[PDB]
Amino acid sequence: TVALVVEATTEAEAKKSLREGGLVPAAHEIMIPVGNMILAVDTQVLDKCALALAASDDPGRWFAENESLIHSTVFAPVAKGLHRVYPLLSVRPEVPAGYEASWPTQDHMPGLHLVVGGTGAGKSSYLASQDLTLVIRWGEPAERFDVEGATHAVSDLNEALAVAFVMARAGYRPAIDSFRNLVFGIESAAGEGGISTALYSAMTAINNVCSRLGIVVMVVVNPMATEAKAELVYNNMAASVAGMTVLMDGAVSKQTVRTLSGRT
Amino acid sequence: PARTRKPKNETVALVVEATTEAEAKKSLREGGLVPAAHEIMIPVGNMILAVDTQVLDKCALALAASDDPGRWFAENESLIHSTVFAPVAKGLHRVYPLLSVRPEVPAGYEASWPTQDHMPGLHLVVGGTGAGKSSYLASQDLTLVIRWGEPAERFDVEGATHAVSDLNEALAVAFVMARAGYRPAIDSFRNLVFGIESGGISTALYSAMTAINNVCSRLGIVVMVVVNPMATEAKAELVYNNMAASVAGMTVLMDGAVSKQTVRTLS
Amino acid sequence: ETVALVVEATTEAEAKKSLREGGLVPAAHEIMIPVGNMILAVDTQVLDKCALALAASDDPGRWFAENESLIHSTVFAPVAKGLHRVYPLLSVRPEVPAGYEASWPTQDHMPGLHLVVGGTGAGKSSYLASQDLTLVIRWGEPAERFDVEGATHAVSDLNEALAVAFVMARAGYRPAIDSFRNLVFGIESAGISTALYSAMTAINNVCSRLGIVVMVVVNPMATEAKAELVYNNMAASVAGMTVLMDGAVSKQTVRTLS
Amino acid sequence: TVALVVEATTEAEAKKSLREGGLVPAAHEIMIPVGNMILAVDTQVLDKCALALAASDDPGRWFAENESLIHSTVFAPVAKGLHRVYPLLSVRPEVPAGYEASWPTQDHMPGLHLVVGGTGAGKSSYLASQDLTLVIRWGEPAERFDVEGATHAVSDLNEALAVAFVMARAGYRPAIDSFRNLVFGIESAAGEGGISTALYSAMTAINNVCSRLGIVVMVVVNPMATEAKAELVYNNMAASVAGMTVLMDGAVSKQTVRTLSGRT
Amino acid sequence: PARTRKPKNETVALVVEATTEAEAKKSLREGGLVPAAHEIMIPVGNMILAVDTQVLDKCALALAASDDPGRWFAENESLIHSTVFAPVAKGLHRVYPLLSVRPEVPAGYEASWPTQDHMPGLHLVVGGTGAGKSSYLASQDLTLVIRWGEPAERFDVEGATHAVSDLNEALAVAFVMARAGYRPAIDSFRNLVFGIESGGISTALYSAMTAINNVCSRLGIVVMVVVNPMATEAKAELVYNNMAASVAGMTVLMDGAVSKQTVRTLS
Amino acid sequence: ETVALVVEATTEAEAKKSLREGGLVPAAHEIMIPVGNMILAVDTQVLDKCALALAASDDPGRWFAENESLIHSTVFAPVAKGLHRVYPLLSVRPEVPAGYEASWPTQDHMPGLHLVVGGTGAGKSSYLASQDLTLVIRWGEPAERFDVEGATHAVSDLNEALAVAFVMARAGYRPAIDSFRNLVFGIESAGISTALYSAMTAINNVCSRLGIVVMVVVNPMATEAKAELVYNNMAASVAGMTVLMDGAVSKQTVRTLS
């Protein structure tokens, strides 16, 4: 149960968790700044969901029957002082002890693996080669894939992150198709490539909460850059995340992966 | 000749929104922040609309039973404004960050129009040719044309039309028509193009088309919509490709004739 | 029966009342007019009463000076602040009354706005003088000789400009508004701010609902390069439009009936 | 006495005058829109001041000893609904019956006469030839003129307009040096010349309240335009006011005056 | 080594502003909207500061009587914050539209520095040469330099300086010094240039200089101020001419030497 | 003695209290830090207590993980909303403590920031590895191998980044912040947004007041055309600055004492 309208008005209420409308994250709450929004992941509800999901016979049914638990895993706190109290919020870069990974590449750092390219680049054909559990579908027009494929459709960024976090923590392999609504949604002062700089900070923040969760989430991003600034934009995105695969006319045109070894 | 609004029987909260957690748990109709199972939110720019699928369904069966689609819509403004409305609770933007509409196709969905096996959603008719686009709409055997945001002309007096004033009733009338088995077209989304403010066109126009497209897909309908994106001739092919990537289908019109047509299909 | 100026609905009961009363639901005789990020309303019942009284006067200009309060009751800005949310991307619906007819500005001219664009001072004066207007509603322009000697009524804001023009036209008179200079300057959006076009379509479509034509002088002040495209966008927004160059009519486009 | 903090909260208070914090101008109140500000002139206090000023032996002492009356002549109402109630407010173009004028030119329409040019154009040398009662000094750095000259120094736009209105109504000849703070202060979408379009509407509004008052006020304006857009800017300003004299390197480079006859 | 703030004896209203007409008639110090005869408002960008000439005068006589100007300013933060403050009442922008500061010169005013018969006001020292501008300030026999908005350097430890943190105390210390007969300079207005946001430079920088210039003229003082407008080399002569047109005087510095000097004078 | 988070002064009495308590007047041990349109505060008394405790630990990195709450009490964002008005165009005053000395990053280096700008990933790593740092405070960068294996402490926001660096430096350790990437992205104003420069001057001058040097990695992301002017503006804002090109030092400017 998450507080939706009533927020802390006294110091005593202010010290409560973000779930309860306070301004101080609980021991199991991690704040996720996205543009000028501030989300929160509850790692105990995430643990509960992962344990339960790993016990179920259908990742499909499970998520459809537990949007209550999903909406409790990642939510947007109601207290409005969060931006002031946590100036220029990011997510701290830390990796769990004993973290290992063989996917999407050997020793892939925990974080996001962006699958990047323009429309028609080959992105929804590359995902099929990554041998995923399912594709989390968000912010994209309904396709034949959403009937015949292995999908879970979601509506906002909370559900997208929540289902991805739960799946990965359960030992499953998630992709989000796509972060279109961050690209369109995060308005900010532009850079040399034309993209809002807050889109880059947003990806680092989301990347580093996957880092803290010791997981990798593969995410489709079409940054809508012109031919000229594309290489500058892809370099700023690679500088923001663990891994990035660039697709161009049906073939991989660049791959950058941060690894536990420092080597490819 | 007038339209009956029966404001007595209207239950959408217009000014009182939830102030407690208990109230916040109510439906968007009631001023809460959590949609009931029959409410789907529709984000468009910085606005959040909502469709009531229960009210939508009963409206469609009534419209189908009526003698005259046009007269029914004229007599039932109240039911139209109860089908698609803008909820009053202000926290919806925060609670549902970067909201879209989830891609879905109801079971057993079939469609032969505008093309065989047309995915549910929007079918944009883009271009800039008043003669061409009307002439194209006249060929699709539309039950009527929902007129919105365009200057009055001969057709509004002459043809099978139903004029509306805002995005709520444009979508409501389209939904009620398609659900009832009729063929709606919206002429036009001119006011989304002008009103949604964010190469050449506000990026938020694209997500608003995806959101509205995906509502139609959840409802298992196709709504044909006229859209003139006002692009420079140079950047027009880019904009048309961005728009095709946001929706189920799109027909392009050039100098009075259909030049291009892209359609996502099933099976 | 006065327009609510500060007190707006705070309960669901008050929200159901009319815009005049501070509610959020128009009465059957109220038509909302969205202009930029303002929302005005015309009261067709007050409009019809004013048109009846004006017809009994021997001088339309004097009648409006004698009836300022009735004008502010014909078109007003409702007080309820949730109207933007409740009516998203509001326009005015394109409708023509039963058995409408017209012969001015042209035969079978659709009801709506007729824009008179471009020209020049002495060339705008001439084209307006050639239209046999009952009077020119003067708005947002510096006082010149015409405001002393001519057949005019000076107004101060867009409510009065629209009100006076609506009342004259429903009375059977021919009004022209000189000019929409404060729409052009006042309405800013994403080389013309795009909300000028929908504003004129909205004002155009209330005229069509009222079954009238209102002539309006409007200079978009576009660069001469973008001018031809600018004027195209304007014509696509209204019933009719005349372009003036060097005193003569260079283009006239009119939507008509049969 | 003008209401400064307490504004109408009921319909009954709303119908009171703008001086009393209502939303409806009294019969003697004229609203003056300037950018996104809305001023008000009280013509009865203006009449009282003009009558009293015409009776005094020193326009100088009079204004210095009566800032109370000055601040009651032009003021900024406190009610905030004014922008909504009066959409796209201007001042209506009307001339008093029997209006005559021989200054600054024969049959000069009532309004503003702008004295326009860049810094060093000759503006404070042209004013000395116009044989003025005094120069109202506003928004300009203190000079030797402010000690040795015939001046009244003011601080805001209310005092500038109020002293000008009172002087002219009293049969005296005022100039305002200068409208610098409108040029700098009125921010708005720019035009083809680079100047905010709200500066033009502001000058028409102020022009037409001089029109209603049957007076001419001469006003120094440096619009800060570049050489290219200068001629386009001066034409938009001339299109906004009764009269305009352009100064360029110490000589008049254009004069446009709207007259009662339509002839020069 | 520290600065004594005595917050007990401080009467500037910081959070309670007038809510009634009677309260609105009080001084700006008291949270009202009408300045007392000894308060002059100072508009700077979208902020409105105020100078208390009574407090200013007593401060100047005390500083003149003290043994050490620097120590006094260090011990009297409270009196400094009582000399120049930002009033709390929010309606000041509306009540005083497009506020400036009226041009005035008190009777009998005389001045020999920076030049003979220098009009009271600001004297800007413009340029971009750290070595040049310090070297120029070192030549004017300044009593000390008010350091504000600049990175700490050797001079702050070495020279006759007094560091401050905000525009209020920068102006207050300058006013109290000049009124007492000492020679202040402010190094620098870097934060007005950066903070005032409206060919190349925010136009509001020019009016803020005129407003501050005209306060100094009403006080019968000259305050020398370092100002780097950050202009492109192309548009630098235009910006320097706009700045000279806003103030009593201005010295231009090029590659380590005074190149130009414009000064409005009296008699 | 906790930082007030929601309750700010509403009376003149409460306004006189400290920033920690929700007042509007800093105590003698509070220094305000304006950054863009945020205002933070450092508590030098909590800072000194933290520096004492940290010195008694055998591992600075572990000490900070053990003392998160003390960090948020060293640097915080005060709750009172009138601070912007009360302290116009706020900076931090340039002052150095009595008998300050320094030999790192260079001899007699002024207290303040030392910027390390440009370079590249492997070239930024090398220059930092060559500075003999106690640890690198990692902020706003994606997790890489260095955050697992290196001498680091990861933080989440600018309060923690500044707090950790202040505490280390007052303890006698050498901190470097990698990086100010969220200042560059987060601070927008009128090709660099101008408020980045005053922000660094403000952060620079609190370091000078504290009598410390803090090394900070910052990539302004300027075009290569404007890069040389950009770096000039940055150097004019801080105590010292190193420019890296292709692994080597291409420029180093430092303000010094004697």
Side-chain angles (χ1 to χ4, degrees):
Chain A
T1 174
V2 169
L4 307 176
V5 291
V6 173
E7 61 178 306
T9 73
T10 74
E11 278 322 301
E13 306 167 342
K15 296 174 93 94
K16 297 189 278 169
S17 65
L18 307 168
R19 165 182 304 263
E20 296 161 296
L23 289 73
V24 178
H28 48 275
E29 286 175 341
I30 303 159
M31 285 180 298
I32 316 177
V34 175
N36 65 29
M37 317 188 276
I38 283 165
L39 307 195
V41 61
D42 187 291
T43 55
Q44 293 184 314
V45 179
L46 173 51
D47 282 348
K48 186 192 189 326
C49 288
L51 290 159
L53 174 59
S56 84
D57 295 339
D58 201 326
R61 283 174 58 248
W62 200 95
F63 282 115
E65 305 175 359
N66 298 257
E67 92 180 36
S68 164
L69 276 172
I70 289 312
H71 286 154
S72 198
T73 301
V74 179
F75 62 88
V78 65
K80 271 67 173 173
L82 290 177
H83 291 71
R84 192 199 75 251
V85 177
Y86 305 109
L88 298 185
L89 182 57
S90 187
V91 187
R92 71 188 197 211
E94 76 162 14
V95 180
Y99 167 89
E100 307 173 26
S102 46
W103 180 86
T105 55
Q106 186 59 24
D107 299 9
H108 200 304
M109 291 289 295
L112 290 181
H113 191 95
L114 304 180
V115 174
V116 184
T119 288
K123 299 198 293 299
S124 291
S125 309
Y126 182 84
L127 284 199
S129 80
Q130 288 321 293
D131 205 278
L132 303 148
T133 306
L134 56 77
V135 181
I136 308 168
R137 289 276 285 162
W138 176 48
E140 286 290 349
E143 288 183 353
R144 170 195 278 142
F145 191 72
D146 299 296
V147 167
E148 308 176 342
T151 51
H152 184 62
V154 301
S155 294
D156 54 69
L157 184 54
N158 285 326
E159 309 173 338
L161 295 187
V163 171
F165 292 169
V166 162
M167 273 178 72
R169 274 309 208 84
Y172 283 112
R173 276 163 54 181
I176 295 168
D177 181 20
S178 75
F179 273 3
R180 184 149 172 260
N181 271 10
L182 275 74
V183 169
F184 293 169
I186 290 168
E187 285 152 336
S188 157
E192 241 267 292
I195 308 316
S196 315
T197 55
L199 178 72
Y200 302 132
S201 62
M203 296 185 292
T204 295
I206 287 154
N207 180 86
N208 288 352
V209 68
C210 293
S211 171
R212 300 189 58 177
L213 296 184
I215 54 158
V216 177
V217 177
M218 168 163 315
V219 171
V220 169
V221 187
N222 182 344
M224 317 279 309
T226 78
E227 266 255 285
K229 317 283 84 167
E231 323 301 334
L232 177 54
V233 167
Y234 294 163
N235 289 328
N236 302 327
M237 279 193 274
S240 310
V241 293
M244 184 186 178
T245 301
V246 182
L247 285 160
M248 195 181 292
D249 297 307
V252 177
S253 64
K254 180 147 75 176
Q255 193 165 77
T256 317
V257 176
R258 294 174 211 274
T259 58
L260 294 162
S261 58
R263 306 177 314 266
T264 55
Chain B
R3 290 183 194 194
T4 311
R5 185 79 188 269
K6 193 70 188 73
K8 185 169 176 71
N9 294 321
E10 305 200 26
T11 48
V12 175
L14 308 183
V15 74
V16 188
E17 64 185 292
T19 185
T20 79
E21 287 309 315
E23 293 165 7
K25 290 185 285 183
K26 307 184 140 181
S27 72
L28 310 175
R29 162 173 315 265
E30 277 143 20
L33 285 159
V34 173
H38 50 274
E39 310 179 307
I40 303 150
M41 293 178 285
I42 310 177
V44 183
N46 64 359
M47 317 167 311
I48 302 177
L49 313 188
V51 60
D52 192 311
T53 52
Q54 295 196 337
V55 174
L56 166 51
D57 277 314
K58 294 186 286 185
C59 276
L61 299 167
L63 178 80
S66 89
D67 301 7
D68 184 70
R71 199 185 82 194
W72 193 93
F73 286 120
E75 318 181 295
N76 283 275
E77 307 192 335
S78 312
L79 275 170
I80 294 301
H81 280 83
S82 167
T83 302
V84 181
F85 59 98
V88 69
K90 300 173 163 150
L92 288 180
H93 279 285
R94 188 202 77 251
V95 165
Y96 304 108
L98 304 176
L99 182 64
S100 171
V101 175
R102 72 202 208 212
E104 273 181 346
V105 184
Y109 166 89
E110 285 190 308
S112 48
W113 176 86
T115 61
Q116 265 302 330
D117 303 316
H118 202 292
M119 275 284 311
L122 289 177
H123 190 101
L124 305 180
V125 173
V126 307
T129 304
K133 288 182 285 182
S134 298
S135 305
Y136 174 71
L137 291 187
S139 69
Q140 304 297 305
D141 279 27
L142 298 174
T143 44
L144 56 87
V145 174
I146 308 165
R147 292 274 291 155
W148 177 47
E150 296 286 356
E153 52 192 276
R154 205 185 308 236
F155 192 68
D156 301 299
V157 167
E158 233 129 83
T161 191
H162 181 71
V164 308
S165 312
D166 67 52
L167 179 59
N168 287 332
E169 48 189 311
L171 300 171
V173 165
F175 294 164
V176 171
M177 264 166 89
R179 284 322 298 259
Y182 298 107
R183 288 210 200 140
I186 304 188
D187 179 26
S188 81
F189 278 178
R190 178 173 140 95
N191 271 6
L192 278 72
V193 182
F194 285 174
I196 292 193
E197 196 277 335
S198 59
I201 306 302
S202 298
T203 58
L205 181 79
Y206 302 129
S207 48
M209 292 189 294
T210 300
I212 296 166
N213 175 89
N214 281 359
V215 184
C216 293
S217 83
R218 292 190 60 182
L219 307 183
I221 67 189
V222 177
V223 172
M224 198 177 277
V225 178
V226 171
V227 178
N228 178 347
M230 303 270 168
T232 76
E233 198 172 356
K235 291 268 153 56
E237 179 183 62
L238 178 60
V239 175
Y240 289 177
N241 284 347
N242 294 333
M243 292 174 67
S246 310
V247 299
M250 166 191 192
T251 296
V252 177
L253 279 71
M254 197 62 59
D255 282 304
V258 165
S259 68
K260 179 186 140 210
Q261 179 165 87
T262 300
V263 166
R264 299 171 213 264
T265 62
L266 279 161
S267 77
Chain C
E1 278 75 337
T2 46
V3 171
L5 299 190
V6 302
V7 183
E8 58 175 313
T10 56
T11 69
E12 286 314 307
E14 312 172 311
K16 306 204 188 260
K17 292 187 287 191
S18 78
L19 304 163
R20 162 172 319 257
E21 290 161 300
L24 285 79
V25 178
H29 55 270
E30 311 186 303
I31 308 180
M32 278 177 311
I33 313 177
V35 182
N37 61 16
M38 309 167 313
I39 298 171
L40 325 178
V42 59
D43 192 323
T44 52
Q45 264 168 33
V46 180
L47 167 55
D48 289 357
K49 181 180 73 168
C50 288
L52 205 71
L54 166 65
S57 174
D58 66 0
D59 191 348
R62 201 196 50 238
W63 190 90
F64 286 112
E66 280 160 4
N67 287 276
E68 273 171 41
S69 296
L70 279 171
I71 282 297
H72 283 96
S73 183
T74 305
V75 183
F76 59 93
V79 69
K81 301 297 191 290
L83 290 175
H84 273 299
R85 190 199 82 250
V86 166
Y87 301 104
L89 299 182
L90 188 47
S91 185
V92 182
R93 58 181 200 232
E95 285 205 332
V96 184
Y100 165 91
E101 315 162 77
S103 66
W104 176 87
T106 53
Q107 191 61 38
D108 302 2
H109 197 302
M110 275 291 297
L113 281 188
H114 192 104
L115 304 182
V116 175
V117 310
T120 194
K124 178 265 294 181
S125 300
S126 295
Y127 181 86
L128 288 184
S130 84
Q131 283 313 302
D132 283 284
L133 309 160
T134 305
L135 58 75
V136 176
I137 302 141
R138 288 278 287 165
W139 177 43
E141 301 285 347
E144 57 176 24
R145 182 182 187 275
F146 187 63
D147 302 304
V148 178
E149 323 282 353
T152 50
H153 181 58
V155 309
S156 298
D157 60 73
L158 172 65
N159 277 338
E160 294 169 28
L162 291 180
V164 167
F166 293 162
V167 164
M168 285 172 85
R170 298 275 287 180
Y173 292 126
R174 315 172 149 191
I177 298 170
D178 185 17
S179 69
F180 273 0
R181 169 185 207 240
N182 277 339
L183 273 73
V184 171
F185 288 1
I187 300 197
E188 302 152 68
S189 51
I192 293 186
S193 61
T194 182
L196 175 72
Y197 302 131
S198 55
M200 294 189 293
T201 305
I203 295 168
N204 181 88
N205 277 353
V206 60
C207 287
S208 78
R209 283 191 80 186
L210 295 187
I212 60 169
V213 175
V214 173
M215 188 153 300
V216 175
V217 182
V218 60
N219 179 357
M221 298 199 37
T223 76
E224 209 155 12
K226 295 167 271 304
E228 196 258 325
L229 159 66
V230 164
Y231 297 162
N232 273 344
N233 290 345
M234 279 194 239
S237 311
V238 298
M241 162 176 199
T242 295
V243 181
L244 296 178
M245 187 192 78
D246 284 310
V249 170
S250 59
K251 179 174 73 168
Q252 172 178 98
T253 62
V254 170
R255 302 172 213 273
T256 69
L257 297 149
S258 63
Chain D
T1 174
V2 169
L4 307 176
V5 291
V6 173
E7 61 178 306
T9 73
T10 74
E11 278 322 301
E13 306 167 342
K15 296 174 93 94
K16 297 189 278 169
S17 65
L18 307 168
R19 165 182 304 263
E20 296 161 296
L23 289 73
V24 178
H28 48 275
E29 286 175 341
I30 303 159
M31 285 180 298
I32 316 177
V34 175
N36 65 29
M37 317 188 276
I38 283 165
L39 307 195
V41 61
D42 187 291
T43 55
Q44 293 184 314
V45 179
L46 173 51
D47 282 348
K48 186 192 189 326
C49 288
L51 290 159
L53 174 59
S56 84
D57 295 339
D58 201 326
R61 283 174 58 248
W62 200 95
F63 282 115
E65 305 175 359
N66 298 257
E67 92 180 36
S68 164
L69 276 172
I70 289 312
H71 286 154
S72 198
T73 301
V74 179
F75 62 88
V78 65
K80 271 67 173 173
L82 290 177
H83 291 71
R84 192 199 75 251
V85 177
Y86 305 109
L88 298 185
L89 182 57
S90 187
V91 187
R92 71 188 197 211
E94 76 162 14
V95 180
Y99 167 89
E100 307 173 26
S102 46
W103 180 86
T105 55
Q106 186 59 24
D107 299 9
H108 200 304
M109 291 289 295
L112 290 181
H113 191 95
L114 304 180
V115 174
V116 184
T119 288
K123 299 198 293 299
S124 291
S125 309
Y126 182 84
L127 284 199
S129 80
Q130 288 321 293
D131 205 278
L132 303 148
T133 306
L134 56 77
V135 181
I136 308 168
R137 289 276 285 162
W138 176 48
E140 286 290 349
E143 288 183 353
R144 170 195 278 142
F145 191 72
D146 299 296
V147 167
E148 308 176 342
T151 51
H152 184 62
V154 301
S155 294
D156 54 69
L157 184 54
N158 285 326
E159 309 173 338
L161 295 187
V163 171
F165 292 169
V166 162
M167 273 178 72
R169 274 309 208 84
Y172 283 112
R173 276 163 54 181
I176 295 168
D177 181 20
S178 75
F179 273 3
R180 184 149 172 260
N181 271 10
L182 275 74
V183 169
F184 293 169
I186 290 168
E187 285 152 336
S188 157
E192 241 267 292
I195 308 316
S196 315
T197 55
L199 178 72
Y200 302 132
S201 62
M203 296 185 292
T204 295
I206 287 154
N207 180 86
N208 288 352
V209 68
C210 293
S211 171
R212 300 189 58 177
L213 296 184
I215 54 158
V216 177
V217 177
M218 168 163 315
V219 171
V220 169
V221 187
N222 182 344
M224 317 279 309
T226 78
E227 266 255 285
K229 317 283 84 167
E231 323 301 334
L232 177 54
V233 167
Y234 294 163
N235 289 328
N236 302 327
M237 279 193 274
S240 310
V241 293
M244 184 186 178
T245 301
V246 182
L247 285 160
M248 195 181 292
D249 297 307
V252 177
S253 64
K254 180 147 75 176
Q255 193 165 77
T256 317
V257 176
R258 294 174 211 274
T259 58
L260 294 162
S261 58
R263 306 177 314 266
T264 55
Chain E
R3 290 183 194 194
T4 311
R5 185 79 188 269
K6 193 70 188 73
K8 185 169 176 71
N9 294 321
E10 305 200 26
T11 48
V12 175
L14 308 183
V15 74
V16 188
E17 64 185 292
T19 185
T20 79
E21 287 309 315
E23 293 165 7
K25 290 185 285 183
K26 307 184 140 181
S27 72
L28 310 175
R29 162 173 315 265
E30 277 143 20
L33 285 159
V34 173
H38 50 274
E39 310 179 307
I40 303 150
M41 293 178 285
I42 310 177
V44 183
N46 64 359
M47 317 167 311
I48 302 177
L49 313 188
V51 60
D52 192 311
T53 52
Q54 295 196 337
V55 174
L56 166 51
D57 277 314
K58 294 186 286 185
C59 276
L61 299 167
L63 178 80
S66 89
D67 301 7
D68 184 70
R71 199 185 82 194
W72 193 93
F73 286 120
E75 318 181 295
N76 283 275
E77 307 192 335
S78 312
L79 275 170
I80 294 301
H81 280 83
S82 167
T83 302
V84 181
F85 59 98
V88 69
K90 300 173 163 150
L92 288 180
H93 279 285
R94 188 202 77 251
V95 165
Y96 304 108
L98 304 176
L99 182 64
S100 171
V101 175
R102 72 202 208 212
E104 273 181 346
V105 184
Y109 166 89
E110 285 190 308
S112 48
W113 176 86
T115 61
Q116 265 302 330
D117 303 316
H118 202 292
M119 275 284 311
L122 289 177
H123 190 101
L124 305 180
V125 173
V126 307
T129 304
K133 288 182 285 182
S134 298
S135 305
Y136 174 71
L137 291 187
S139 69
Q140 304 297 305
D141 279 27
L142 298 174
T143 44
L144 56 87
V145 174
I146 308 165
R147 292 274 291 155
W148 177 47
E150 296 286 356
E153 52 192 276
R154 205 185 308 236
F155 192 68
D156 301 299
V157 167
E158 233 129 83
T161 191
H162 181 71
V164 308
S165 312
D166 67 52
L167 179 59
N168 287 332
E169 48 189 311
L171 300 171
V173 165
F175 294 164
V176 171
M177 264 166 89
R179 284 322 298 259
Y182 298 107
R183 288 210 200 140
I186 304 188
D187 179 26
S188 81
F189 278 178
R190 178 173 140 95
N191 271 6
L192 278 72
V193 182
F194 285 174
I196 292 193
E197 196 277 335
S198 59
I201 306 302
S202 298
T203 58
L205 181 79
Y206 302 129
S207 48
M209 292 189 294
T210 300
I212 296 166
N213 175 89
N214 281 359
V215 184
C216 293
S217 83
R218 292 190 60 182
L219 307 183
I221 67 189
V222 177
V223 172
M224 198 177 277
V225 178
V226 171
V227 178
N228 178 347
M230 303 270 168
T232 76
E233 198 172 356
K235 291 268 153 56
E237 179 183 62
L238 178 60
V239 175
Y240 289 177
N241 284 347
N242 294 333
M243 292 174 67
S246 310
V247 299
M250 166 191 192
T251 296
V252 177
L253 279 71
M254 197 62 59
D255 282 304
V258 165
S259 68
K260 179 186 140 210
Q261 179 165 87
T262 300
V263 166
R264 299 171 213 264
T265 62
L266 279 161
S267 77
Chain F
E1 278 75 337
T2 46
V3 171
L5 299 190
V6 302
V7 183
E8 58 175 313
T10 56
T11 69
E12 286 314 307
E14 312 172 311
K16 306 204 188 260
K17 292 187 287 191
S18 78
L19 304 163
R20 162 172 319 257
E21 290 161 300
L24 285 79
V25 178
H29 55 270
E30 311 186 303
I31 308 180
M32 278 177 311
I33 313 177
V35 182
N37 61 16
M38 309 167 313
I39 298 171
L40 325 178
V42 59
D43 192 323
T44 52
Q45 264 168 33
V46 180
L47 167 55
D48 289 357
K49 181 180 73 168
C50 288
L52 205 71
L54 166 65
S57 174
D58 66 0
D59 191 348
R62 201 196 50 238
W63 190 90
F64 286 112
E66 280 160 4
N67 287 276
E68 273 171 41
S69 296
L70 279 171
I71 282 297
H72 283 96
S73 183
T74 305
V75 183
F76 59 93
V79 69
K81 301 297 191 290
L83 290 175
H84 273 299
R85 190 199 82 250
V86 166
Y87 301 104
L89 299 182
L90 188 47
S91 185
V92 182
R93 58 181 200 232
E95 285 205 332
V96 184
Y100 165 91
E101 315 162 77
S103 66
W104 176 87
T106 53
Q107 191 61 38
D108 302 2
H109 197 302
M110 275 291 297
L113 281 188
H114 192 104
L115 304 182
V116 175
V117 310
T120 194
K124 178 265 294 181
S125 300
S126 295
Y127 181 86
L128 288 184
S130 84
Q131 283 313 302
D132 283 284
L133 309 160
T134 305
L135 58 75
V136 176
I137 302 141
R138 288 278 287 165
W139 177 43
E141 301 285 347
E144 57 176 24
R145 182 182 187 275
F146 187 63
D147 302 304
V148 178
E149 323 282 353
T152 50
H153 181 58
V155 309
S156 298
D157 60 73
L158 172 65
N159 277 338
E160 294 169 28
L162 291 180
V164 167
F166 293 162
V167 164
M168 285 172 85
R170 298 275 287 180
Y173 292 126
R174 315 172 149 191
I177 298 170
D178 185 17
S179 69
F180 273 0
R181 169 185 207 240
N182 277 339
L183 273 73
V184 171
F185 288 1
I187 300 197
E188 302 152 68
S189 51
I192 293 186
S193 61
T194 182
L196 175 72
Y197 302 131
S198 55
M200 294 189 293
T201 305
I203 295 168
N204 181 88
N205 277 353
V206 60
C207 287
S208 78
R209 283 191 80 186
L210 295 187
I212 60 169
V213 175
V214 173
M215 188 153 300
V216 175
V217 182
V218 60
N219 179 357
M221 298 199 37
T223 76
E224 209 155 12
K226 295 167 271 304
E228 196 258 325
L229 159 66
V230 164
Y231 297 162
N232 273 344
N233 290 345
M234 279 194 239
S237 311
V238 298
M241 162 176 199
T242 295
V243 181
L244 296 178
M245 187 192 78
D246 284 310
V249 170
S250 59
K251 179 174 73 168
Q252 172 178 98
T253 62
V254 170
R255 302 172 213 273
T256 69
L257 297 149
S258 63

